[PDB]
Design a protein around this nucleic acid. Structure first.
Ligand SMILES: [Mg+2]
Ligand SMILES: [Mg+2]
Ligand SMILES: [Mg+2]
Ligand SMILES: [Mg+2]
Ligand SMILES: [Mg+2]
Ligand SMILES: [Mg+2]
Lengths: 124, 141
RNA sequence: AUGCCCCGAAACCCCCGGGCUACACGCGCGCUACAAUGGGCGGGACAAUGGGUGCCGACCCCGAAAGGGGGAGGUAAUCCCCUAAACCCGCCCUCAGUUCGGAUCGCGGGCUGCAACUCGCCCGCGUGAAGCUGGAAUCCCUAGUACCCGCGCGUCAUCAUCGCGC
RNA sequence: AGCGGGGUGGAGCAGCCUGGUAGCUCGUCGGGCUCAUAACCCGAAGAUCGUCGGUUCAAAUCCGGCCCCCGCUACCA
């Protein structure tokens, strides 16, 4: 009842080159990794590695909704912009291979009211 | 000789149909995959299902257990590259149902967008919802 | 284009992320169907308009497919897009929610792009919803016209159930 | 207090007597017609019969006990 991703434990995923890991992800993630990371993602990754090393005792806030979750990011809490505020996300092992934006909804759930004037033919 | 009901892999099969179409009653087997397994087993896909003998049924079930090891291509199975083991699997009946349920449950545990959409019973693959997808009752003004 | 009134360190000018794609519900215009005046599998036939150098790409090789690697010729009555579909012949299915219908969803593989989650398009296996011809009402059309069938251009990095034409 | 009568969609009435589909008119919601409203047309929702029991192959219908409503009469601190 441990975690496995394609028959690998978490540690085996930790000690992998970015290329070796890219062969396990779905096609969209593989193409995104092969084409390189954008500069903003580079800065975010630098901050993440610093925080893991034992420095940067501050919360991580980022505008990068298109960043792919990587195994070395597991255990940290990231604040992802949803359009008007930063929401906390706690990265769990079963999130590997997803974009960050999937965990920060940008619209509010709809609870309908009573239909107003002009909602039907007879109300006009 | 002729049997009007033949039991294969826990599903009764109509004995009057051609074997390729009789096989589709199994959940997880469509018309294309059925023809593939008929060809691999070396049986005429146009024969009546009622003329199957016991050894032939045993062989068909053996093939359905692990198609890849019997020569069926990896790009033909309904769950390639399994999320847990990493292998190429083909699931039928209950196993298929519980695998799909587990996939949706995993999506729901991490509070992903698609998991929320599954919970609320709303379209998941990006459809517009202002006009179509209406299932309910007209409200009064 | 332009008078008057307003803002004139914000109502002007840039950058990042969201939205215009929300969803108990009412309506317009369409597409796909409810099967035999058919569905599937193999085989055989015959176009026109337009467009191409930030582009059209034959021909060879690799891959099951979507696609990938090289690349002649073309600034074009010369080279390319470009060997249409409805139609015809043979076999399977025989009136059934089905070998009718293909919505919805799972897993995997690709392309464009600085970026594909919100929110793109394509391919393989699986899954298999409503629908069995439609009340009161109401639209279009007089001849190569209406019905039926595909194709080109515009938009366009990618994307056509649309517009204008054939 | 005594006697007589009756309870059925939101409203007012059939369906009893002769047991075996719960109908009629208005009303609400939606679509039609008209430049728009009313009138008119179409479709759908809505009571399982005041409750409880007995009878019967089967009860709104036959019977009985309760709850409520209406009418008539006796009734002088
Ligand atoms: Mg809009
Ligand atoms: Mg079909
Ligand atoms: Mg998406
Ligand atoms: Mg029918
Ligand atoms: Mg348009
Ligand atoms: Mg009116």
């Amino acid at each position: 009842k441990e975690f496995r991703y394609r028959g690998y434990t978490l540690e085996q995923l930790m000690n992998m080159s970015l290329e070796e890991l890219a062969k396990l992800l779905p096609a969209r993630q593989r193409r995104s990794l092969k084409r390189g990371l954008t500069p903003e993602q580079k800065k975010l990754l630098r901050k993440i590695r610093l925080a893991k090393k034992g420095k940067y005792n501050k919360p991580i806030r980022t505008h990068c909704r298109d960043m792919i979750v990587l195994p070395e990011m597991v255990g940290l809490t990231i604040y992802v912009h949803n359009g008007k505020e930063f929401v906390p996300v706690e990265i769990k092992p079963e999130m590997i291979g997803h974009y960050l934006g999937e965990f920060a909804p940008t619209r509010k759930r709809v609870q309908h009211g009573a239909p107003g004037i002009g909602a039907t033919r007879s109300s006009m | 000789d002729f049997r009007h009901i033949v039991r294969v892999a826990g599903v009764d099969l109509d004995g009057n149909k051609q074997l390729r179409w009789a096989l589709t009653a199994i959940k997880g087997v469509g018309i294309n995959f059925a023809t593939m397994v008929c060809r691999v087993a070396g049986l005429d896909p146009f024969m009546k299902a009622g003329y199957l003998t016991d050894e032939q049924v045993k062989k068909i079930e053996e093939i359905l257990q692990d198609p890849v090891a019997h020569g069926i291509p990896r790009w033909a199975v309904n769950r390639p590259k399994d999320y847990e083991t990493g292998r190429d699997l083909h699931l039928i009946t209950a196993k298929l149902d519980m695998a799909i349920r587990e996939d949706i449950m995993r999506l729901r545990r991490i509070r992903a967008y698609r998991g929320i959409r599954h919970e609320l019973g709303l379209p998941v693959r990006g459809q517009r919802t202002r006009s179509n997808f209406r299932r309910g009752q007209t409200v009064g003004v």
